[PDB]
Scaffold this active site. Sequence first.
Site, PDB file in Angstrom:
ATOM      1  CG  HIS A 145      49.048 -23.232  -2.569  1.00 35.19           C
ATOM      2  ND1 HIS A 145      49.204 -21.968  -3.100  1.00 35.19           N
ATOM      3  CD2 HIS A 145      49.130 -23.104  -1.231  1.00 35.19           C
ATOM      4  CE1 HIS A 145      49.367 -21.104  -2.117  1.00 35.19           C
ATOM      5  NE2 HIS A 145      49.348 -21.772  -0.976  1.00 35.19           N
TER       6      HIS A 145
ATOM      7  CG  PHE B 183      45.605 -19.829  -3.880  1.00 33.22           C
ATOM      8  CD1 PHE B 183      45.475 -20.918  -3.044  1.00 33.22           C
ATOM      9  CD2 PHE B 183      46.181 -18.683  -3.369  1.00 33.22           C
ATOM     10  CE1 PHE B 183      45.925 -20.898  -1.736  1.00 33.22           C
ATOM     11  CE2 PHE B 183      46.621 -18.624  -2.059  1.00 33.22           C
ATOM     12  CZ  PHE B 183      46.476 -19.742  -1.246  1.00 33.22           C
TER      13      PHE B 183
ATOM     14  CD  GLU C 252      45.455 -17.373   2.526  1.00 37.70           C
ATOM     15  OE1 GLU C 252      45.763 -18.578   2.489  1.00 37.70           O
ATOM     16  OE2 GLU C 252      46.016 -16.519   1.830  1.00 37.70           O
TER      17      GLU C 252
ATOM     18  CE1 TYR D 136      47.141 -19.316   5.937  1.00 40.86           C
ATOM     19  CE2 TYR D 136      48.530 -20.766   7.258  1.00 40.86           C
ATOM     20  CZ  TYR D 136      48.218 -20.173   6.057  1.00 40.86           C
ATOM     21  OH  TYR D 136      48.966 -20.440   4.924  1.00 40.86           O
TER      22      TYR D 136
ATOM     23  NE  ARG E 101      46.306 -21.713   2.816  1.00 41.69           N
ATOM     24  CZ  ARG E 101      47.079 -22.795   2.793  1.00 41.69           C
ATOM     25  NH1 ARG E 101      46.577 -24.006   2.979  1.00 41.69           N
ATOM     26  NH2 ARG E 101      48.385 -22.625   2.587  1.00 41.69           N
TER      27      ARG E 101
ATOM     28  CG  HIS F  33      47.249 -14.662   6.195  1.00 44.34           C
ATOM     29  ND1 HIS F  33      47.053 -14.385   4.853  1.00 44.34           N
ATOM     30  CD2 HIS F  33      47.917 -15.842   6.244  1.00 44.34           C
ATOM     31  CE1 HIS F  33      47.585 -15.367   4.142  1.00 44.34           C
ATOM     32  NE2 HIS F  33      48.107 -16.267   4.944  1.00 44.34           N
TER      33      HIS F  33
HETATM   34  N1  LIG Z   1      48.806 -16.606  -4.468  1.00 40.52           N
HETATM   35  C1  LIG Z   1      48.373 -15.773  -3.527  1.00 40.52           C
HETATM   36  N2  LIG Z   1      48.944 -15.792  -2.325  1.00 40.52           N
HETATM   37  C2  LIG Z   1      48.415 -14.915  -1.452  1.00 40.52           C
HETATM   38  C3  LIG Z   1      47.393 -14.040  -1.663  1.00 40.52           C
HETATM   39  N3  LIG Z   1      47.118 -13.286  -0.520  1.00 40.52           N
HETATM   40  C4  LIG Z   1      47.985 -13.720   0.334  1.00 40.52           C
HETATM   41  N4  LIG Z   1      48.790 -14.731  -0.142  1.00 40.52           N
HETATM   42  C5  LIG Z   1      50.020 -15.161   0.513  1.00 40.52           C
HETATM   43  O1  LIG Z   1      51.008 -14.352  -0.183  1.00 40.52           O
HETATM   44  C6  LIG Z   1      52.215 -15.129  -0.344  1.00 40.52           C
HETATM   45  C7  LIG Z   1      52.431 -15.556  -1.824  1.00 40.52           C
HETATM   46  O2  LIG Z   1      51.668 -16.733  -2.129  1.00 40.52           O
HETATM   47  C8  LIG Z   1      51.999 -16.289   0.634  1.00 40.52           C
HETATM   48  O3  LIG Z   1      52.173 -15.645   1.938  1.00 40.52           O
HETATM   49  C9  LIG Z   1      50.460 -16.571   0.499  1.00 40.52           C
HETATM   50  O4  LIG Z   1      50.023 -17.214   1.732  1.00 40.52           O
HETATM   51  P1  LIG Z   1      49.293 -18.558   1.993  1.00 40.52           P
HETATM   52  O5  LIG Z   1      50.060 -19.794   1.695  1.00 40.52           O
HETATM   53  O6  LIG Z   1      49.003 -18.514   3.471  1.00 40.52           O
HETATM   54  O7  LIG Z   1      48.056 -18.407   1.174  1.00 40.52           O
HETATM   55  C10 LIG Z   1      46.775 -14.026  -2.935  1.00 40.52           C
HETATM   56  O8  LIG Z   1      45.846 -13.286  -3.228  1.00 40.52           O
HETATM   57  N5  LIG Z   1      47.308 -14.950  -3.829  1.00 40.52           N
END
Ligand SMILES: Nc1nc2c(ncn2[C@@H]2O[C@H](CO)[C@@H](O)[C@H]2OP(=O)(O)O)c(=O)[nH]1
EC number: 4.6.1.24
Length: 104
Positions: free
Chosen positions: A92, A100, A58, A38, A77, A40
């Site tokens: 989440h 999300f 995020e 993070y 986040r 990222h």
């Molecule tokens: N659900 C979701 N996850 C994302 C998105 N962009 C990045 N992620 C990341 O993609 C993977 C699937 O969820 C995880 O690595 C999540 O990380 P984070 O837990 O750090 O958000 C997005 O737009 N939506």
Amino acid sequence: ACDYTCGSNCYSSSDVSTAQAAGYKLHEDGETVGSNSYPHKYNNYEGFDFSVSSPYYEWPILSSGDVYSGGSPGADRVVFNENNQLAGVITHTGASGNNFVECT
Ligand SMILES: Nc1nc2c(ncn2[C@@H]2O[C@H](CO)[C@@H](O)[C@H]2OP(=O)(O)O)c(=O)[nH]1
Ligand SMILES: [Ca+2]
């Protein structure tokens, strides 16, 4: 009253600004923290209708009030852009798998 409610976590505007400033600083310097690196990119697979433009990033916001420094990021986040504009606060919690939903 909470400015943002993520499941049962309650955040004020102040909490959000503090978290966002830390995440943006790391972003600007090209550094990351934690095993998920993070801050990222946030791809917006969910398709939220953010009022500010991509690209988006995020960064974890913690219910303890501390700034994220590694270890478990929890479910919540803050999403900010290249201009350090807040896009939204997401979680989440209450979403299936690793999806999300918006904090209310
Ligand atoms: N659900 C979701 N996850 C994302 C998105 N962009 C990045 N992620 C990341 O993609 C993977 C699937 O969820 C995880 O690595 C999540 O990380 P984070 O837990 O750090 O958000 C997005 O737009 N939506
Ligand atoms: Ca607080």
